[PDB]
């Protein structure tokens, strides 16, 4: 009940920090994916 499973209290443990850093890296690699594919990354045509 006071663990990191609940969304609010999760941010206290640095495991949340590590997880978000890693998922940020594995999201930012998608930018290089779009770089290779020649597509558009600098803008999003959804929910502007």
């Amino acid at each position: 009940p006071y663990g990191m499973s609940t969304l609010e209290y999760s941010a206290y443990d640095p495991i949340f920090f590590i997880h978000h850093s890693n998922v940020d890296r594995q999201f930012a690699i998608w930018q290089a994916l779009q770089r290779y594919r020649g597509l558009d990354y600098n803008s999003a045509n959804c929910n502007i």
Binding site: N45, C46, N47, I48
Partner: peptide
Amino acid sequence: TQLASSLLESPSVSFVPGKKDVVRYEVSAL
């Protein structure tokens, strides 16, 4: 009757791309 507006959420916006008669002028704009 003017019904509520909560039963419909916020509309989203999106964009899609696609596929004689002489007239003397000033010397500054020349």
